[PDB]
Design a protein around this ligand. Structure first.
Ligand SMILES: *[C@@H]1O[C@H](CO)[C@@H](O[C@@H]2O[C@H](CO)[C@@H](O[C@@H]3O[C@H](CO[C@@H]4O[C@H](CO)[C@@H](O)[C@H](O)[C@@H]4O)[C@@H](O)[C@H](O[C@@H]4O[C@H](CO)[C@@H](O)[C@H](O)[C@@H]4O)[C@@H]3O)[C@H](O)[C@H]2NC(C)=O)[C@H](O)[C@H]1NC(C)=O
Ligand SMILES: *[C@@H]1O[C@H](CO)[C@@H](O[C@@H]2O[C@H](CO)[C@@H](O[C@@H]3O[C@H](CO)[C@@H](O)[C@H](O)[C@@H]3O)[C@H](O)[C@H]2NC(C)=O)[C@H](O)[C@H]1NC(C)=O
Ligand SMILES: *[C@@H]1O[C@H](CO)[C@@H](O[C@@H]2O[C@H](CO)[C@@H](O[C@@H]3O[C@H](CO)[C@@H](O)[C@H](O)[C@@H]3O)[C@H](O)[C@H]2NC(C)=O)[C@H](O)[C@H]1NC(C)=O
Ligand SMILES: *[C@@H]1O[C@H](CO)[C@@H](O[C@@H]2O[C@H](CO)[C@@H](O[C@@H]3O[C@H](CO)[C@@H](O)[C@H](O)[C@@H]3O)[C@H](O)[C@H]2NC(C)=O)[C@H](O)[C@H]1NC(C)=O
Ligand code: A1A5G
Ligand SMILES: *[C@@H]1O[C@H](CO)[C@@H](O[C@@H]2O[C@H](CO)[C@@H](O)[C@H](O)[C@H]2NC(C)=O)[C@H](O)[C@H]1NC(C)=O
Ligand SMILES: *[C@@H]1O[C@H](CO)[C@@H](O[C@@H]2O[C@H](CO)[C@@H](O)[C@H](O)[C@H]2NC(C)=O)[C@H](O)[C@H]1NC(C)=O
Ligand code: CLR
Ligand code: NAG
Ligand code: NAG
Ligand code: NAG
Ligand code: NAG
Ligand code: NAG
Ligand code: CA
Ligand code: CA
Ligand code: CA
Ligand code: CA
Ligand code: CA
Ligand code: CA
Ligand code: CA
Ligand code: MG
Lengths: 946, 718
């Protein structure tokens, strides 16, 4: 925000050394602050690249810096029949550099360690190491937790178990407040990742020169995992420390694994015992989610919040459906041990291939506003793709999407500016944090110094109405009575460690709306519509108030009466003096405006006394937690007294409420306008009802309010509505309070289906049949104690018509049948049958927790008993299965209201090819008998008659 | 009526035309009391003033060059013209949208050049033995569909950099495979071996001459090789007049960008070719793996159809990656790679069945809406691609371009290119926001109150405030104030208290945060829908406080999407046909169906329930609902009459159908993972023999007749 992009400090080192790859702040015993930088390609004495560390002191102009001296010679030792060799060539020393109190730790992951024994060898691999230096005591030490004397054949015979030959430890090093150095080894355990934690004091007291291999008593490493998901996970790219469980005894660790779960990206939060407390998965594969992990209390609630990056994230654009810009995720820690949910906030870059979010650096409270601030570096952001840094300020609701400030890269193309960022240190001792940004491409470091931030408050007071008839003052140098009034302007500057001398320019303009020649009011003294003054606020903690006299021109000089008079006050910094570089940056209420009017239609007393009445109605009473709740608020305002000046509707809504739309039923061309702004913590909505209205005016406004997720708002939510007016008498009407109850209810749907729909059996093991039941929590709410009972005919016996081959649940539900299903191992006129009549088998399923959106599946595979199928094959078969499910309670404070129930029936019918049932020939026999009787009687009648 | 041209305007021809998409100007002098020159063309025609000077520009979509689509391609590929028109000219008036139509056709045979990029991992050693006799078979199979074929071959192992290489022992540098006592060559990032050529003998000779290397890390950096092949067109010789195929084969994971940190490489990957005459990638040891975005961009630019051939272990991962990169076809490769020929043939058949369009050089000033049309007259709004096509099939598209305001360039151009095809349409749009009459200029005319102002097509604009019709009201003059000439429906504040009633009209002021216009100063900017700082949702533009959408969007907030590309399923039915698509999201109307396209349902009814008509038509060419022509309209599965009834299909299910003959017909449905739904049916279903009564009753009646005849002859004798 207040960072100065002009006055920057430049530090440079040897060319081609990738200087500025890693940087950090260092504090001595006397408080002197220096910058520790690591160059991973510094030329060594043997004309080979080995890396180095530089300690730049605080110089206003910068320049060359001293280089720390570390051993850069291969060390060979012989113990028994074993030979240990160390090769530091191309070790990349200074790749990761950290500082703690008076200890500087610089790690070289690429250092090579080799073990030889006669013929067999352990192979040369880049195990890496870390050099610790204490300049105050002039002490040096080395740390390498992946040094051993195990041959390669041993690992081969052990299936590469405990394969710590490729640790590359020291890629990401962190130090806790207790001084416990933690190093990440993504390549450890054969490209799986691990951590190595060790006290610094123990390392110093447990280091002996000439002892290449040693073991520390307190050395501890993470346990290897055989889960295939972790394969090629590179767990340990970024490591950070923080507090999540709320107990200060334990220090939680956060580790980023971009390649975890088949190139998915993840962030794992573990305790001090390497136990998985929580895991956060990525959004899109190959996004490199988890590249950088940061811990900071952005919201200021007292609970640490998490920031994650994904440079390789791909967005969607109209020109192209895919665009690689990167993303940044913000997670806020909820109250209690509740697990982290969806990302609190999402930030997306603009420039293509910008790798936004690669580096995130906390900056503390840069503006001293009570909220922490952060910086995000895009290596190749901006229109020119030379890198950029975006500063995000903190707030109660999180972080503002719009970047407060953007800093470009003065270096040319290929500088890779913004690769590593660090801050939250008052290097200049100016009371505000500064920033340091390295650039290995340009081989330089740029230091930005923050400037003091001053908050300005401006207040303007003027008579509500003016009476032309009353003329108390007199024009200067004459004796012409004229109306007059007093204008008061109060200006107040606040800040921390503000300069003792401060100057500001205040411009007061009267009737700025009208042209200069058309102005109606002027200043009594200067007889001008505008004036400028210089205010010295240096050391004036209390606000400075000034008063002036203004007059109104003669009536004959103008004809407009209903047009209000606008008075504007503008506060600005002094014009840039010699040398530019303003001392401080001023922000806040730097411009204020007010409107007045002439006494009109206020009665004989000439004083307006408006009387307003307000009524409010609410529609949409049922509010469901976790649902898109929409409330319709209808406010009707009426005026029974005189016209009210500057009448507006002010509405205060709960934390989870928001403003979407508002219309006016009365009048089709009113064009009502509303705005929403955060006053202190809640988004208050002000609607401009209208300028001074006519007598007996009624206005109705219907607005839509969207209520978000709410779990602690209580039984009911409250809304406040009021009428705001600038009139001296009756400035506001009666306050209206509306209580909307909140009730939680969820609906769960049970469905069932049997396959195949139609089955034919011809005329051991019979045809397969599968019945599947699905339970879905379609309702926005959540349920607990989900219980289900499925009843089927048969008891899984040979005599039973159907034999339950197997049952499979899915979704975590615990299901148990009764009687036992599948007693044998088994290495392989419709008739209605139900549990009520036929033998009943009941399977009971339970689910203590059932989150919204999850689906529980139950599948049963069975077949028709062929020995029973053969018997009586001329009768149709229709089996039935009955599922009944309900719940016990809900995870919500509101007791209301029971529910939901569910019944499901699944019918499976079997068919046979042209059953041999007795065809109704009985009708044919009856017809034949009738015909025979008719023939016989006809013959008898025609024969006896003759 | 007042309409919108007459209202919120009447200042000049530029504004008069710019207020609304369609307006007409009466340049010729006429009565000024009727507020003319800005109204519907019909209204002006009623008021006359048409001396051939009417200024009513209309957008045009004239075609510059167009040629017929070639029926077949055998030679002279330079003028295939498979896509028409080649180039068109568009002239759109400001705040107007115009649309045109294009057609896409596949011209039968088309030359094809295929580059086979293969991994040489240890597990692939056996696979290398299965390619020694693949060139002849591939040439013979491809000859049926293509007459001219080009084949190139390249091999890769892994990135040659520590720790991916066995640096120690020193003897292992030239023979890392020393533990197993085998022969191997040094690891190489990429080694092109055979350039594109039509000689099968060269391909056969090239194979069996290479070997298999060794690597430690399971993932293989094939993206580097793919990018080098795509960019190094000159090195291998890509031909712009042929179908480009790149068959990438591997049996292990693949690295991504920023993965070189382990090896110490930090330089971002560059798309420039770095392959010399040595046929090696020099920057392999110093260049990081390419990013997905750059790979996709280069693939689209070079128009290369990428075909993955991987084992079932990583087939799911490669399928997940496939949906990201456009124009990619996946496949399953056996351990012995004995199905490589069939797999590549299937991939070639499938890729040509998918058609997609891409927009290039498209400025953000204008927006495009696409409508697709497959075979038949069926049209799918909000779609730019069609599925379920075949060789020689023709599809249609409609592209509508809408512009906002008036860009200050007057010349813009863009291109619409189908995937994997050289031919593309070039669309040039020119903005004509200035009235023709303005060319007269007449900066000084005596009609502007004795030549103290500027004249323009019947309107005098004068000074910094002189707005009167005769250019006399001035800005400081007009002190007396009239009535019923500044506000409508007297009884409300003049100009809505926003402006000054001067010159007989409301002049707007306070030009802050935007511009204010209108007769009474009622329409203003900086009054659009906002959420956290955005204006008009960041997609459309707000006029008079209403945030009108641009193309591809609709709604008051202009946040609901209209295009259905995202919600398009692979079965050719929007959201799989089980639901609708709103704002790019699928809503499943049918209960029990969920997912991105509602396709993932466990409890849906079996397919055979609604496949009865298809099988009925196939087996008898008749049935109910035949008038609607539903025999082949939704069921794309292939029906075959096979009496096997013993296929071991994993994703195969038996089912039964009922016919009017009362004989149940049992048939199998197999939904292969490749999507080739196939039905197996038994021809002439065996109806059990029922009739056994007609003969019996015939015999009974014959016996009765014989008895009657015996009685008759007895009577005769008696
Ligand atoms: C590409 O795909 C999109 C998305 O489906 C299509 O956009 C739709 O196109 C339809 C066809 O035009 C629109 O519906 C129709 O279009 C009428 C415009 O033509 C007028 O017709 C009247 C008939 O008396 C004439 O007098 C006029 O002079 C015009 O010629 C629409 O008026 C109408 O739709 C209704 O219009 C009324 C009045 O405007 C609205 O109040 C009502 O809400 C409704 O929109 C008619 O049904 C359809 O609206 C449109 N979709 C939209 C705008 O979202 C493209 O047309 C496709 N591309 C091509 C080249 O066809
Ligand atoms: C969901 O609904 C079912 C049925 O609608 C409820 O089943 C209830 O189960 C209990 C046993 O767990 C029944 O009590 C038992 O009754 C038997 C006699 O049938 C008696 O011998 C036992 O000592 C015991 O008292 C209870 O009657 C039964 N409810 C009904 C209405 O029959 C179930 O409780 C509901 N809730 C859940 C979470 O499942
Ligand atoms: C390739 O694509 C598949 C399919 O889109 C993806 O795998 C899917 O990953 C999601 C992760 O959210 C799985 O859902 C989750 O399942 C777990 C149980 O394993 C459950 O506890 C979670 O609540 C969530 O529902 C989903 O089942 C899974 N589906 C499949 C078919 O794998 C993923 O993007 C890629 N999978 C690969 C490459 O294996
Ligand atoms: C067009 O606008 C111009 C100003 O931009 C007008 O010029 C001024 O017009 C007034 C008309 O009353 C002139 O005043 C008269 O001029 C005579 C002769 O010079 C003189 O005796 C008096 O001062 C008389 O009031 C004024 O001189 C003239 N100014 C200039 C610099 O020429 C012009 O009149 C406008 N055209 C019209 C009204 O047709
Ligand atoms: O296929 C081969 N290499 C492959 C590469 C490759 C090498 C080893 C390998 O497993 C690693 C499994 C990880 C186990 C974890 C270890 C830590 N704890 C949890 C489990 C996978 C791929 C290539 O070169 O592409 C290959 N086959 C061989 C046969 C004999 C000797 C060596 C051989 O190497
Ligand atoms: C979009 O393009 C279509 C096709 O060019 C236009 O529809 C044609 O309109 C003309 C005259 O209006 C008719 O003669 C054609 O028969 C129509 N063809 C079709 C296929 O509809 C349509 O008017 C265009 N719409 C816009 C807004 O420009
Ligand atoms: C357009 O604007 C709002 C605000 O951005 C949109 O809100 C998004 O809604 C989708 C699905 O409804 C969610 O997945 C996003 O997370 C929402 N984003 C935000 C920032 O809230 C919404 O899509 C549109 N508005 C309305 C009223 O539909
Ligand atoms: C199965 C069929 C072919 C048998 C039919 C044979 C019938 C028509 C025969 C069997 C016995 C017969 C009868 C036997 C004896 C006599 C007595 C004689 O004085 C008059 C005829 C009379 C009454 C015969 C009439 C015909 C008769 C009823
Ligand atoms: C050495 O440093 C200079 C400093 O500007 C730089 O320009 C140059 O490229 C570097 N390398 C060589 C070989 O000079
Ligand atoms: C840490 O543990 C010690 C020893 O049990 C305890 O005294 C202290 O309170 C703990 N810290 C906390 C609870 O913050
Ligand atoms: C207030 O004064 C400053 C001084 O430069 C100026 O930049 C700013 O625009 C002024 N405010 C307004 C509203 O004009
Ligand atoms: C906002 O709420 C806080 C509660 O801490 C209160 O102190 C403050 O006065 C409120 N804001 C206003 C403008 O009153
Ligand atoms: C069909 O039934 C046969 C036996 O009748 C069985 O072997 C087969 O698995 C079933 N399914 C299919 C798809 O054939
Ligand atoms: Ca803790
Ligand atoms: Ca917090
Ligand atoms: Ca802050
Ligand atoms: Ca500072
Ligand atoms: Ca009064
Ligand atoms: Ca490999
Ligand atoms: Ca193989
Ligand atoms: Mg391999």
């Amino acid at each position: 925000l207040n960072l100065d992009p002009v006055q920057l400090t430049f530090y440079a080192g040897p060319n081609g050394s990738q200087f500025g790859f890693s940087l950090d702040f260092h504090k001595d015993s006397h408080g002197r602050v220096a910058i520790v930088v690591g160059a991973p390609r510094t030329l060594g004495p043997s004309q080979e690249e080995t890396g180095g560390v530089f300690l730049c002191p605080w110089r206003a102009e910068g320049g060359q810096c001293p280089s720390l001296l570390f051993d850069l010679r291969d060390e060979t030792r012989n113990v028994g029949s074993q030979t240990l060799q160390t090769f530091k060539a191309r070790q990349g020393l200074g790749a990761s550099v950290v500082s703690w109190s008076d200890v500087i730790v610089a790690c070289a992951p690429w250092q090579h360690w080799n073990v030889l024994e006669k013929t067999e060898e352990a192979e040369k691999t880049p195990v890496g190491s870390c050099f610790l230096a204490q300049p105050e005591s002039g002490r040096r030490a080395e740390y390498s937790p992946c040094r051993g004397n195990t041959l390669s054949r041993i690992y081969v015979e052990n299936d590469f178990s405990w394969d710590k030959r490729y640790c590359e430890a020291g890629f990401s090093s962190v130090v806790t407040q207790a001084g416990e150095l933690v190093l990440g080894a993504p390549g450890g355990y054969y490209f799986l990742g691990l951590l190595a934690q060790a006290p610094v004091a123990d390392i110093f007291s447990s280091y002996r020169p000439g002892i290449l291999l040693w073991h520390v008593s307190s050395q501890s490493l993470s346990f290897d995992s055989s889960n295939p998901e972790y394969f090629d996970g590179y767990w340990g790219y970024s490591v950070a420390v923080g507090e999540f469980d709320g107990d200060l005894n334990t220090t939680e660790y956060v580790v980023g694994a971009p390649t975890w779960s088949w190139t998915l990206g993840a962030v794992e939060i573990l305790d001090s015992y390497y136990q998985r407390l929580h895991r956060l998965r990525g959004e899109q594969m190959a996004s490199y989610f988890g590249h950088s992990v940061a811990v900071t209390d952005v919201n200021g609630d007292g609970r640490h919040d998490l920031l994650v990056g994904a440079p390789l994230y791909m967005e969607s654009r109209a020109d192209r459906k895919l665009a690689e810009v990167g993303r940044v995720y913000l997670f806020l820690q909820p109250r209690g041990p509740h697990a982290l949910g969806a990302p609190s906030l999402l930030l997306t870059g603009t420039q293509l291939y910008g790798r936004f979010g690669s580096a995130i650096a906390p900056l503390g409270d840069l503006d001293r506003d009570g909220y922490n601030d952060i910086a995000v570096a895009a290596p190749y952001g901006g229109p020119s793709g030379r890198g950029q840094v975006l500063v995000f300020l903190g707030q109660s609701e999180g972080l503002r999407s719009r970047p407060s400030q953007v800093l470009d890269s003065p270096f040319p193309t290929g500088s890779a500016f913004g690769f590593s960022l660090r801050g939250a240190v008052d290097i200049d001792d100016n009371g505000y944090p500064d920033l340091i940004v390295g650039a290995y491409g340009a081989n330089q470091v740029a230091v930005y110094r923050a400037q003091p931030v001053v908050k300005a408050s401006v207040q303007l007071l003027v008579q509500d109405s003016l009476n032309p008839a009353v003329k108390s003052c007199v024009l200067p140098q004459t004796k012409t009575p004229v109306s007059c009034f007093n204008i008061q302007m109060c200006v107040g500057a606040t800040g921390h460690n503000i300069p003792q001398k401060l100057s500001l320019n205040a411009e007061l303009q009267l009737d700025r709306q009208k042209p200069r020649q058309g102005r109606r009011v002027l200043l009594l003294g200067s007889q001008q519509a505008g004036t400028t003054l210089n205010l010295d606020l240096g050391g004036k903690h209390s606000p400075i108030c000034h008063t002036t006299m203004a007059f109104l021109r003669d009536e004959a000089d103008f004809r407009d009466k209903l047009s209000p008079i606008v008075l504007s006050l503008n506060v600005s910094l002094p014009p840039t003096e010699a040398g530019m570089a303003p001392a401080v940056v001023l922000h806040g209420d730097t411009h204020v405006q007010e409107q007045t009017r002439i006494v009109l239609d206020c009665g004989e007393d000439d004083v307006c006394v408006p009387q307003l009445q307000l009524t409010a109605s609410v529609t949409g009473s049922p509010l469901l937690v976790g649902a898109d709740n929409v409330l319709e608020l209808q406010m009707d305002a009426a005026n029974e007294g005189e016209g009210a000046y500057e009448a507006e509707l002010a509405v205060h809504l709960p934390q989870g409420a928001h403003y979407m739309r508002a219309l006016s039923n009365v009048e089709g061309f009113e064009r009502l306008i509303c705005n929403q702004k955060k006053e202190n913590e809640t988004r208050v909505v002000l609607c401009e009802l209208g300028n001074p209205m006519k007598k007996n005016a009624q206005i109705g406004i219907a607005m839509l309010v969207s209520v978000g997720n709410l779990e602690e708002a209580g039984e009911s939510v409250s809304f406040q509505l009021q009428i705001r007016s600038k009139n001296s008498q009756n400035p506001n009407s009666k306050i209206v309070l509306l209580d909307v109850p909140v009730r939680a209810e969820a609906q769960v749907e049970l469905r069932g289906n049997s396959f195949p729909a139609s089955l034919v059996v011809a005329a051991s093991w019979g045809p397969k049949v599968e019945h599947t039941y699905e339970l879905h929590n379609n309702g926005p709410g959540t349920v607990n104690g989900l219980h289900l009972s499925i009843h089927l005919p048969g008891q899984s016996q040979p005599s039973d018509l159907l034999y339950i081959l197997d049952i499979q649940p899915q979704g975590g539900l615990q299901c148990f049948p009764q009687p036992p299903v599948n007693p044998l191992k088994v290495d392989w006129d419709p008739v209605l049958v139900s549990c009520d009549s036929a033998p009943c088998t009941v399977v009971q399923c339970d689910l203590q927790e059932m989150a919204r959106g999850q689906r529980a599946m139950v599948t049963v595979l069975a077949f028709l008993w062929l020995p029973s199928l053969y018997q009586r094959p001329l009768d149709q078969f229709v089996l039935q299965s009955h599922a009944w499910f309900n719940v016990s309670s809900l995870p919500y404070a509101v007791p209301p209201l029971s529910l939901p129930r569910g019944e499901a029936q699944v019918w499976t019918q079997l068919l046979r090819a042209l059953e041999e049932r007795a065809i109704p020939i009985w009708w044919v026999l009856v017809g034949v008998l009738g015909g025979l009787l008719l023939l016989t009687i006809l013959v008898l009648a025609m024969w006896k008659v003759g | 009526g007042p309409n919108i041209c007459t209202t919120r305007g009447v200042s000049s021809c530029q504004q008069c035309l710019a207020v609304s998409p369609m307006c007409a100007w009466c340049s010729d002098e006429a009565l000024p009391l009727g507020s003319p020159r800005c109204d519907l063309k019909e209204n002006l025609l009623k008021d006359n003033c048409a001396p051939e000077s009417i200024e009513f520009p209309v957008s045009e979509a004239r075609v510059l060059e167009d040629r017929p689509l070639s029926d077949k391609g055998s030679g002279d590929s330079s003028q295939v013209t498979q896509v028409s028109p080649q180039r068109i000219a568009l002239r759109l008036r400001p705040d107007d949208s115009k649309n045109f139509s294009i057609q896409v056709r596949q011209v039968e045979d088309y030359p094809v050049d295929i580059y086979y990029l293969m991994d040489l991992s240890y597990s692939m050693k056996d696979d290398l033995w299965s390619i020694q006799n693949l060139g002849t078979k591939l040439a013979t199979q491809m000859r049926k569909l293509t007459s001219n074929l080009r084949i190139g071959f390249g091999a890769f192992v892994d990135k040659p950099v520590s720790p991916y290489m066995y640096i120690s022992p020193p003897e292992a540098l030239e023979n890392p495979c020393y533990d197993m006592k085998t022969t191997c060559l040094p690891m190489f990032g990429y080694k092109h071996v055979l350039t594109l050529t039509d000689q099968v003998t060269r391909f056969n000779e090239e194979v069996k001459k290479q070997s298999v290397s060794r690597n430690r890390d399971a993932p293989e950096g094939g993206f580097d090789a793919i990018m080098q092949a795509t960019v190094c067109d000159e090195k291998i010789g890509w031909r712009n007049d042929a179908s480009h195929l790149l068959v990438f084969t591997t049996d292990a994971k693949t690295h991504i960008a920023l993965d070189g940190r382990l090896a110490g490489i930090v330089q971002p990957n560059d798309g420039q070719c770095h392959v010399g005459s040595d046929n090696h990638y020099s920057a392999s040891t110093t260049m990081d793996y390419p990013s997905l975005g750059l790979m996709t961009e280069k693939l689209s630019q070079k128009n290369i159809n990428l075909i993955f051939a991987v084992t079932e272990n990583v087939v799911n991962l490669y399928q997940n990656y496939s949906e990201l990169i456009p124009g990619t076809t996946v496949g399953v490769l056996s351990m012995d790679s004995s199905n490589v020929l069939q797999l590549i043939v299937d991939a070639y058949g499938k890729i040509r069945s998918k058609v997609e369009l891409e927009v290039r050089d498209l400025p953000e000033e204008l927006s495009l809406s696409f409508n697709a049309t497959c075979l038949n007259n069926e049209v799918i709004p909000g779609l730019k691609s069609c599925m379920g096509l075949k060789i020689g099939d023709t599809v249609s598209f409609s592209i509508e371009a809408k512009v906002r305001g008036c860009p200050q360039e007057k010349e813009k151009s863009f291109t619409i290119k189908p995937v994997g095809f050289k031919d593309s349409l070039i669309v040039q749009v020119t903005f004509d926001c200035d009235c023709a009459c303005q060319a007269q200029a007449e900066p000084n005319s005596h009609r502007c109150n004795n030549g103290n102002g500027t004249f323009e097509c019947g309107v005098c604009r004068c000074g910094p405030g002189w707005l009167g019709s005769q250019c006399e009201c001035s800005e400081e003059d007009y002190r007396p104030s009239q009535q019923d000439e500044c506000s409508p429906r007297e009884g409300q504040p003049v100009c809505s208290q926003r402006g000054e009633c001067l010159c007989g009209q409301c002049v707007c002021h306070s030009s802050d945060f935007g511009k204010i216009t209108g007769k009474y100063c009622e329409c203003d900017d900086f009054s659009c829908v906002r959420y956290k700082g955005e204006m008009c949702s960041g997609h459309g533009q707000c006029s008079c406080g209403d945030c009108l959408c641009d193309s591809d969007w609709t709604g008051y907030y202009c946040n609901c999407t209209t295009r259905t590309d995202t919600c398009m399923s692979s079965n050719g039915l929007l959201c799989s046909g089980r639901g609708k698509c709103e704002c790019g999201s699928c809503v499943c109307i049918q209960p029990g169906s969920y997912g991105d396209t509602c396709e993932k349902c466990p409890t849906c009814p079996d397919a055979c329930t609604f496949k009865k008509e298809c099988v009925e038509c196939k087996k008898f060419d008749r049935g109910a609902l035949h008038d609607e022509n539903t025999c082949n309209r939704y069921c794309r599965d292939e029906i075959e009459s096979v009496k096997e009834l013993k296929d071991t299909g994993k994703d195969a299910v038996n089912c039964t159908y009922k016919n009017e003959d009362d004989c149940v017909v049992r048939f199998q449905y197999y939904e292969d993972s490749s999507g080739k739904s196939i039905l197996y049916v038994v021809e002439e279903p065996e109806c059990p023999k029922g009739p056994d009564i007609l003969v019996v009753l015939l015999s009974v009646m014959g016996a009765i007749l014989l008895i009657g005849l015996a009685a008759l002859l007895i009577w005769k004798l008696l």
